Amino acid sequence: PWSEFRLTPAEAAAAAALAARCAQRYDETDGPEFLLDAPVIAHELPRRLRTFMARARLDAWPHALVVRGNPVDDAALGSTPVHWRTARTPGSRPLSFLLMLYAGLLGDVFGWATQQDGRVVTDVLPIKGGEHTLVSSSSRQELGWHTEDAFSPYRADYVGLLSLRNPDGVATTLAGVPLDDLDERTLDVLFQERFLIRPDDSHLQVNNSVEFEGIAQAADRPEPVAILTGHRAAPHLRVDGDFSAPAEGDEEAAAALGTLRKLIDASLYELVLDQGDVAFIDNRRAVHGRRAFQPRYDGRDRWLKRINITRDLHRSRKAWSRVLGQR
Amino acid sequence: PWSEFRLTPAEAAAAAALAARCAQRYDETDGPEFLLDAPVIAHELPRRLRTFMARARLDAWPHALVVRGNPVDDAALGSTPVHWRTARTPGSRPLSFLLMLYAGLLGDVFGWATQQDGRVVTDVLPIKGGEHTLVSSSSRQELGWHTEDAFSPYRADYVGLLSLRNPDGVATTLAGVPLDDLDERTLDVLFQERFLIRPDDSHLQVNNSVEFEGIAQAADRPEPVAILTGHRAAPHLRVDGDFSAPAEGDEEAAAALGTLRKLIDASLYELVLDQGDVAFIDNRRAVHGRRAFQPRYDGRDRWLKRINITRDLHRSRKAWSRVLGQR
Ligand SMILES: N=C(N)NCC[C@H](O)[C@H](N)C(=O)O
Ligand SMILES: N=C(N)NCC[C@H](O)[C@H](N)C(=O)O
Numbered sequence: 130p131w132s133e134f135r136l137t138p139a140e141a142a143a144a145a146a147l148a149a150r151c152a153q154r155y156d157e158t159d160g161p162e163f164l165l166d167a168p169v170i171a172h173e174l175p176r177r178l179r180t181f182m183a184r185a186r187l188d189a190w191p192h193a194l195v196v197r198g199n200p201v202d203d204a205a206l207g208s209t210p211v212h213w214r215t216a217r218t219p220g221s222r223p224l225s226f227l228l229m230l231y232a233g234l235l236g237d238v239f240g241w242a243t244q245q246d247g248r249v250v251t252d253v254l255p256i257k258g259g260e261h262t263l264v265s266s267s268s269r270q271e272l273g274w275h276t277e278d279a280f281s282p283y284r285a286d287y288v289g290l291l292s293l294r295n296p297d298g299v300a301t302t303l304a305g306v307p308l309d310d311l312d313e314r315t316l317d318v319l320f321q322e323r324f325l326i327r328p329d330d331s332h333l334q335v336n337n338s339v340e341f342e343g344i345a346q347a348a349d350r351p352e353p354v355a356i357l358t359g360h361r362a363a364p365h366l367r368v369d370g371d372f373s374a375p376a377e378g379d380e381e382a383a384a385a386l387g388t389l390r391k392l393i394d395a396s397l398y399e400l401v402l403d404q405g406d407v408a409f410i411d412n413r414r415a416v417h418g419r420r421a422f423q424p425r426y427d428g429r430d431r432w433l434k435r436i437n438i439t440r441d442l443h444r445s446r447k448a449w450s451r452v453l454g455q456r
Numbered sequence: 457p458w459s460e461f462r463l464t465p466a467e468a469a470a471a472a473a474l475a476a477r478c479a480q481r482y483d484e485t486d487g488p489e490f491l492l493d494a495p496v497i498a499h500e501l502p503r504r505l506r507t508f509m510a511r512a513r514l515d516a517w518p519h520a521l522v523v524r525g526n527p528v529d530d531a532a533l534g535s536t537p538v539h540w541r542t543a544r545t546p547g548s549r550p551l552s553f554l555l556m557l558y559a560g561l562l563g564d565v566f567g568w569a570t571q572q573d574g575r576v577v578t579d580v581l582p583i584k585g586g587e588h589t590l591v592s593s594s595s596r597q598e599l600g601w602h603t604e605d606a607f608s609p610y611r612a613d614y615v616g617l618l619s620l621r622n623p624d625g626v627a628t629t630l631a632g633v634p635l636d637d638l639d640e641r642t643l644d645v646l647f648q649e650r651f652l653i654r655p656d657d658s659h660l661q662v663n664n665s666v667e668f669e670g671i672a673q674a675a676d677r678p679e680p681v682a683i684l685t686g687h688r689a690a691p692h693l694r695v696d697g698d699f700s701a702p703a704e705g706d707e708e709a710a711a712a713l714g715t716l717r718k719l720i721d722a723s724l725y726e727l728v729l730d731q732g733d734v735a736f737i738d739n740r741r742a743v744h745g746r747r748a749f750q751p752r753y754d755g756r757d758r759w760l761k762r763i764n765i766t767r768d769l770h771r772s773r774k775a776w777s778r779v780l781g782q783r
């Protein structure tokens with residue numbers, strides 16, 4: 130259900146070489162300079178990869194675009210950081226640039242003022258003491274399926290994930306719209322503005338080191354929104370298993386959401402991002418999550434770099450440029 | 457108020473050479489093959505141009521992106537066609553490929569099932585007998601300002617225009633949102649769903665050689681929509697001077713539209729696309745039109761190639777792929 134591309138060793142080496150050169154020439158991935166240049170520098174990636182990204186993005190069906198086979202040297206990479214705060218390590222620097230280059234082929238990258246200190250390239254790793262939380266630094270508790278930043282009209286079109294390491298093969302989870310099982314009445318209701326979607330815990334002040342006011346308003350006074358939009362035969366999806374609810378006292382909407390939860394749970398499947406694998410999850414066609422795992426805390430924990438991507442930065446003008454948020 | 461780039465002779469020659477090679481290798485511009493390949497082939501355009509297009513698209517202010525200095529040889533080009541039907545002349549073929557290459561740097565190109573026989577690259581030229589019409593083949597009557605395909609939620613983000621010839625320097629017209637003069641109450645009303653926007657005459661059966669049913673429904677039963685959307689301090693614009701109206705009996709909406717017409721008329725400015733100039737008009741920030749001119753009908757009339765561009769083809773899934781329309 131996803132579109133997959135495997136780099137040849139030579140293509141992977143070329144891509145890595147390009148990223149290393151970027152790492153040499155630019156101070157940081159999130160600097161204004163590299164943010165502007167990355168989409169043009171990405172034109173120098175291997176042609177077969179550029180072709181895959183240009184075409185696969187336009188296909189009607191894939192839940193994600195997956196690129197396998199980027200080399201990662203654990204010795205060069207170094208130990209998995211204990212927190213996202215200190216996760217911009219020299220060993221992980223070239224791979225962060227690599228992710229941004231791939232991302233630039235798909236759209237405009239951005240971050241959130243209220244998430245990991247406004248960083249554009251973010252980190253997914255287990256944080257000691259946060260095993261049973263609802264955020265991506267969890268481990269022992271499964272990260273439930275969700276549309277990324279479901280609360281926001283400015284949520285990403287694609288979520289990019291690059292696996293720096295994943296020694297025990299922990300699965301990312303995905304599900305599309307369960308169209309084979311949604312009856313027309315349920316479908317009709319899911320297309321109506323009868324649902325409340327609150328911001329997830331990654332946007333809380335406690336999970337960072339004026340935009341928090343907007344988050345508080347989205348949490349306190351969510352306006353009713355639809356779960357499905359667009360074409361009945363291929364709807365776009367906006368839902369969060371741990372932060373969605375029906376509108377106050379709307380039992381029809383509730384029943385539709387209840388049914389949707391059951392169908393998504395039943396159709397949820399696994400994608401293992403092995404070391405060096407990159408996935409760009411279509412945040413409109415699919416929800417995603419991560420399986421429960423036992424963290425190590427020995428320096429070799431599973432570690433991903435992540436980036437939010439929009440097809441059009443100007444659609445979020447109200448929340449501006451590369452770091453989004455509102456009052 | 458637009459962003460301008462001038463090709464050096466060498467850059468222009470290189471771009472032309474690239475387009476000529478495409479014209480040699482592909483049967484047509486609108487074929488599935490070239491539609492898919494163009495965005496990747498465009499990576500081979502001159503780097504300074506690719507840089508301009510990548511950055512200028514992300515700027516907050518421009519009403520259009522303008523590229524000057526593509527050579528056009530009138531002798532090679534041949535005479536201006538008498539109708540769009542016969543306008544895919546060998547002389548104009550390389551320049552059509554050139555426009556599609558530039559367009560591919562900005563987004564996904566598409567056409568309409570109900571406009572110029574579903575062509576993606578379309579033609580703007582004066583048609584004898586149609587001087588006083590509301591379509592782009594007019595001449596003696598000014599083409600009034602408009603958002604392109606304002607009636608449709610799937611209208612282009614950018615409209616690309618390449619001037620094949622314009623010997624008498626006829627001006628394209630542009631206007632942005634008149635924010636310096638819209639009072640808050642008027643602004644509030646323009647942001648509300650209190651306006652009717654009907655499809656323009658280019659979507660009629662008479663202006664072509666099941667999607668016409670959708671056009672008929674948009675004409676007969678238009679649903680109320682807003683004129684302004686997005687950020688109050690930089691709104692997006694959706695209006696058509698010859699096809700917009702207030703909702704039935706809504707005099708407040710009417711007064712807001714009346715005021716907007718006056719302010720747009722007063723702020724309308726001119727952009728002359730000389731032979732070889734290309735403009736990508738931001739269809740969300742600006743309305744555009746064309747000044748009245750006396751047509752020649754001697755074979756050297758003003759002639760443009762045109763293309764519709766979206767940042768995201770999947771947003772129009774309901775109306776699908778590269779040729780849009782509904783029942
Ligand atoms: N949406 C839920 N349920 N949890 C938040 C997961 C998201 O991926 C969030 N941006 C995070 O990083 O924790
Ligand atoms: N919108 C008005 N008023 N007229 C139609 C002009 C448009 O550019 C139309 N696509 C045309 O080519 O005539």
Ligand SMILES: O=C(O)CCC(=O)C(=O)O
Pocket residue numbers: 253265272277288290300301302417418419433435
């Ligand atoms: O850990 C993963 O594989 C995905 C976690 C996730 O949902 C995210 O980073 O947004």
Ligand SMILES: O=C(O)CCC(=O)C(=O)O
Pocket residue numbers: 580592599604615617627628629744745746760762
């Ligand atoms: O003739 C021009 O310059 C622009 C006409 C126009 O509005 C269009 O082609 O969409």
Ligand SMILES: [Fe+2]
Pocket residue numbers: 275277417418
């Ligand atoms: Fe997520």
Ligand SMILES: [Fe+2]
Pocket residue numbers: 602604744745
């Ligand atoms: Fe137009």
